[PDB]
Structures are given as C-alpha cells and as structure tokens.
C-alpha cells in the first residue's frame, strides 16, 4: 500500500491537477460530496493511493494546490468537484508571479515554499511507504516554472529516494502565449535535470493536433484538451490503484525507462482515441490500439519520432484482454520500425497490464517513450534562448530580483550539455 502525493503549481498546473481529480474520482467512485457511491470493491481495496480516509466515509485527495496568483483558487473551488479538497491544502498567495522565473525563485515564491513545505510534510508523515511525488506544472510561464522547481529541489533534498514524476507543459513552436518562455522554461529545465526522475514533456500544439487530426473536434477548449493529459497521467499509475497481471509501478517504469540518470526526458501518449463519428464504429482490438498508439500523431510533445531513434518505449495497458496480442504486436512494431529503434538495446519495450479499464471504456493503453526526438523541443528552445539572450533582452526584470548574470550562461551550458549525449544516440 503505497502513496503518490499529487502536487501542482501555476494556473496551468492547477487546472490540470483539477481535471486529473475528476477522472481519478470517476475511476474510484467518488462524487463531489466526498462519500463513496459506486458499484465495486476493487475501487476501495486500494483507495489509499490518492485519498486519505476521514471520518464519515469522506475521502480527501492528497493534493497540494499551489499558485502565487490567487485567482485560479476560486476557479478550482468553482469546478463541480470543488467540495473534495481540504481548505488547508489550498495554499494561497497574495501577489502575482508576473511571468517571471526569478519572481518565483528568489522572491515571494521563496517565502511561500515554507508553508508549502509544511503542508507536504504534514501529509507525508500520514503514510506508511510514500512512493513519491507527482508535480504537474508549466515549464513556460511563472509560478510553477520557478516556485514549482523550488518545491522540486526542496522535496528532492528532503526525501532523496522517492520517485518524482513531473508532468511539464513545454512551450510550443507555432504559438507562444508568453514572450519570456525561452527564459522561464530553460531556467526551469536546469533545475529539472539534477532533481526529478521522470519528466513528461506535454505540448499544447501536439494536443491541439490530436484534437483536430485525431479527435476531430471544432472548438477544443482547455478542458477538452486538458483532459487528455489527465487521462495519460491517470493511466501511468494504474497497477497501484487496480490489480492486474504483470503489474508495474513508477519505479517499474523508471528502472526500465531511463538508461542514464540524466536521460530522463520522455514524451507521453494515450491513444484509445477516436471521434464521436467513428466512436460507435471502432472495433477495439490490441493491434488497433498499438497501431494508433505508435503513430506519430497521438504523441503529446511537438516532436517527430520519425526524426530520431527511440531509446525505450513502454505501453501500460489496461483492460480485460489477451496479452499474447500485446506481446507479438509490439514485437511486430519493433521488428517493422527497426531503424527508429536503437540497435544497442534489444527488447526495448516494457509491457504491463492492468485488469480494470477506465470507466466508460472497454480497454485503454498509455504510451511512455524515452526518445532522442526531444531535441526538436530542447535544441529549439536553445536557439530561442541564445537569439534572445545575445541582445541582453528582457533582462532587468530578471537581474534586479536578486539574481546574477552568469547563471543564464550556466543554464545555456547545461542545456547544451543535455544536447550532447542524446545527439550521440542518433548515430550511436
């Protein structure tokens, strides 16, 4: 019986944490009033993965609601599942992040991390074996970019052996809702690369491409987009909440997925996905799941798998099925797209099956892939950072907050340091 603490910061990380909690509550049978009203008992067998039991049958999520701007708090309480969190776990802040990484790193974020640390402590001692932490935030922007990395660094220093999964919203190349994303996200990536163990780079343009050219919608709003991230981030940690054959936890994913400690940059995928038109006409089979998974369209980062060899690939499956088709269908894709796999790792695909499918679905599967195609993200933001840092641009907002010049150079140096050993895998 093992716990994942779900912590989320920023106005993006907050609302993905919110949207995560309805799909977890529907999978575990919890209504907005907090009582269990469902049909099974497997949903209560391992309810102590996300929900602390209270008096009167009230299950309360072990979530930490963080942001510097006190505006998304009223929204996350305004959602339909608003009367489910502690009003102590909403940690407020009466200022603005101001779209500044230094503002969350060396100022009022750094005086709010003490209260957030007290909250994460007081929940952390209410466990028997805490498996780890799960931060959802946005790399580009404020609050969660800087002060989320404060929380990452502090809890990594305080618990040094717990599995850290961070779902990070990288900026998009086509559209950017923020000028200072090449500053914020690079300075956040430096803090990520000696800290967390499992990143998940999630791109808004990739999600929008899934919404049009896979989901085939017309007005994809943030909630409709946002839920896909919620679904993959529910499907990764499913063998801990529901039983199955050949289970897998987050360390099970990690020890199979990261070859080197620095090579911990994934990009995810959740594809039992289809349009409302094709919905009644899907003939759900394991080959049909695998083929539509491994296609370079459902991939949740703005990166092309055809431009780079996969290091390792995991398919956390869910549903009542025969896993023989699972085994030889991923064998077939491994042997077919052989040039897109590295030759120095045989059998680079992790298989795992959960018995219980998500509610309303017959079966599903979550793709987690360590690829060398992450360069179309990281190198891209590196040219953005260099071409903007050369003219010393937008800088006084960063250097006047108590921040020296040369750790920008350290950030660029240790992002180009990420560039090297994964360029190396393109030509072995």
């Amino acid at each position: 019986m093992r716990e994942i603490v779900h912590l989320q910061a920023g106005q993006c990380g907050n609302q993905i944490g919110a949207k995560f909690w309805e799909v977890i509550s529907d999978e575990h049978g919890i209504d907005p009033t907090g009582t269990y009203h469902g049909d099974s008992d497997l949903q209560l067998e391992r309810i102590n993965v996300y929900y602390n039991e209270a008096t009167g049958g009230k299950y309360v999520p072990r979530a930490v609601l963080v942001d510097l701007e006190p505006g998304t708090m009223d929204s996350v309480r305004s959602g339909p599942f608003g009367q489910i969190f502690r009003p102590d776990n909403f940690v407020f802040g009466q200022s603005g992040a101001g779209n500044n990484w230094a503002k969350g790193h060396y100022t009022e974020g750094a005086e709010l991390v003490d209260s957030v640390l007290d909250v994460v402590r007081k929940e952390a001692e209410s466990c028997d074996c805490l498996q780890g932490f799960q931060l959802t935030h946005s790399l580009g922007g404020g609050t969660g970019s800087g002060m989320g990395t404060l929380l990452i660094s502090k809890i990594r220093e305080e618990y040094p052996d717990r599995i850290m999964n961070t779902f990070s919203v990288v900026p998009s190349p086509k559209v950017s809702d923020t000028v200072v994303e090449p500053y914020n996200a690079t300075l956040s990536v430096h803090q990520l690369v000696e800290n967390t163990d499992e990143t998940y780079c999630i791109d808004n343009e990739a999600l929008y491409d899934i919404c049009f050219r896979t989901l085939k919608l017309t007005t994809p709003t943030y909630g409709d987009l946002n839920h896909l991230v919620s679904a993959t981030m529910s499907g990764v940690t499913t063998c801990l909440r529901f039983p199955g054959q050949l289970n897998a936890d987050l360390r099970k994913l990690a020890v199979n997925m990261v070859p080197f400690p620095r090579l911990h940059f994934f990009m995810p995928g959740f594809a039992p996905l289809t349009s409302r038109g094709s919905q009644q006409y899907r003939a759900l089979t394991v080959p049909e799941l695998t083929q539509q998974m491994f296609d370079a369209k459902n991939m949740m980062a703005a990166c092309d798998p055809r431009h780079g060899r996969y290091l390792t690939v995991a398919a956390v499956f869910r549903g009542r099925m025969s896993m023989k088709e699972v085994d030889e269908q991923m064998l077939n894709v491994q042997n077919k797209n052989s040039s897109y796999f590295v030759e120095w790792i045989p059998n680079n695909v992790k298989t795992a099956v959960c018995d219980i499918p998500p509610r309303g679905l017959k079966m599903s599967a979550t793709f987690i892939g360590n690829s060398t195609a992450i360069q179309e993200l990281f190198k891209r933001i590196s040219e953005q950072f260099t071409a903007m840092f050369r003219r010393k641009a937008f800088l006084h907002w960063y250097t006047g907050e108590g921040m020296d010049e040369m750790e920008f150079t350290e950030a660029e140096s240790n992002m180009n340091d990420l560039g090297n050993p994964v360029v190396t895998r393109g030509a072995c």
Binding site: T33, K216, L217, S275, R276, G277
Partner: protein, 267 residues
C-alpha cells in the same frame, strides 16, 4: 480567414457538430424524462417548502398548546448599524442549497432564517408542542417549558446548545439555532415578558396571541435574535440569520431585536 458557420449548415465540421448536438440533446432529454435534473429537484423542493397552510383560530386572545402559531420579529426603529433589513420578518426553515442538493432533506443540522414574508407559507408555520406533561388544549404560560416543531411527515424541532469551537452562527460567531429530529432537553424553549421590571409577577399568566414576548432557551439563558446587520444569501430571496444571545440595553432591558411576536389566525 474563413467564415466559421454554425448549426444547420452542412459545411466544415457539421458532421461532428450534429453528432455532438445529438449526444448532448439525448443526454438532456434522458435527464428530463427520468426527472433527475437540477430544476426538477428545485421545483419539487420548492413546492414541498412553499405549500400553503392555515393558522389556528384564536377563540380567545391566548395561544394554546398544539396550535399552528408562526414566529415573527416586528419592525424596528433601531439604528445601531446603517445596514438594516426590512420589518416584520418571520422565522423560516432554510436548508442549505448545495449540501442538500441530492436526496430528500438534510439531517440534524438544517438552518433557520427570518424571511420578509407575513403569510403562513408552510416553511414558517410552527406547532407549539407540549414538551412536558400537558394536552392539546391547554394555554401556553409565561415561563413554561414549551417546544417548537415544524415538518415527508417528520417533525423537526427547534434546538440549540452551548457554544463550542465546532459550530456557531454562520455569519456571526454566536450560538446556533438549528432543526433537529431528536428529542432531548435541548429542544425546549420558554417565553418571558419584555419589561424586566414587570416580568416576574407576570410569570404564571397566559400569553396573548400577537404580543411582544422573549424566547429563552432553558439550557443557556439566551434569547432568539435576528441579526439584522448582515444577510444570508439563500434561494428564497435574501434574508437574515437568527441566533441565541440575550442583548441588554441601558436599563437591563432587551433590545427590539431580542423581541419575538407570535402570530395566530385573526381574520
């Protein structure tokens, strides 16, 4: 850019538009036919809490036991706070309109208010029950242990107890008055005279129908008060809360918002 058309026109994403419209329309008609939607629940709860009743006839100008008598708080000239609220308010039932939502009626805490209505409307009609040993015909006496009940066919009773750091009045922080279903000593109130000089001799006398009396909970010696400064935002208009704390003035006299008049049928 493009023209970005809407419903009916067969261009662009019209196919998935009509698919989503049919799915949402099917969900709405399914909920409408099964009668599980929010406004249907609202209408049922409203008819149940707004069903009209009748007031007992006062054959003599005295309130008896077991008769349907409404609690009203009279109009006030008090100006101790600028934010005032109306006159001739009434003690009414207020179940909370999100924590109720589902099911049929809440439990041991319900909540009381004082609306601006003067007609007997069903959520404000109280039966003056017996508490101690009496019958359906005896007259209520000054300083006698009477009881207030209101109805699903389940008699809820007006109740309160002492102040702890778990519960209080909602907007203020004083004692809470709430509707229980249990039966104990906490349900019991009493009546007393407004004037503290000519009170103790009137102890042991009948109560007039429409007259100023004070209601004291006989476990804490606190009087029923309509906290006119503030407001409770509930569905049935906007009205005030009611609590229990004896407010005194410059003569050990009770302020006009301690006072509570009772209402019988006087056509």
């Amino acid at each position: 850019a493009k023209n970005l058309y809407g419903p009916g026109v067969r261009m662009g994403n019209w196919n998935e538009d009509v698919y989503l419209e049919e799915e949402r329309m099917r969900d709405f008609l399914a909920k409408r036919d099964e009668g599980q939607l929010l406004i249907q629940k609202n209408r049922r709860l409203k008819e149940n809490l707004l069903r009209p009743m009748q007031l007992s006839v006062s054959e003599d100008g005295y309130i008896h036991y077991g008769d349907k008598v409404m609690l009203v708080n009279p109009d006030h000239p008090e100006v101790e706070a600028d934010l005032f609220l109306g006159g001739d308010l009434s003690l009414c039932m207020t179940p909370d309109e999100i924590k109720a939502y589902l099911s049929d009626e809440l439990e041991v805490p319900c909540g009381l208010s004082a609306a601006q209505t003067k007609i007997p409307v069903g959520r404000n009609t109280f039966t003056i029950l017996c508490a101690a040993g009496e019958v359906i015909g005896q007259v209520v006496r000054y300083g006698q242990n009477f009881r207030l009940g209101i109805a699903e066919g389940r008699m809820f009773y007006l109740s309160s107890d002492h102040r702890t750091l778990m519960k209080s009045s909602k907007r203020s922080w004083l004692q809470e008055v709430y509707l229980t279903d249990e039966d104990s000593y906490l349900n019991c109130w009493q009546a007393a005279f407004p004037d503290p000089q000519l009170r103790l001799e009137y102890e042991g006398f009948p109560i007039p129908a429409n007259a100023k009396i004070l209601i004291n909970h006989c476990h804490t010696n606190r009087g029923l008060v309509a906290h006119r400064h503030l407001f409770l935002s509930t569905y049935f208009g906007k009205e005030v809360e009611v609590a229990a704390h004896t407010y005194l003035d410059s003569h050990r006299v009770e302020k006009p918002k301690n006072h509570w008049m009772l209402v019988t049928g006087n056509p």
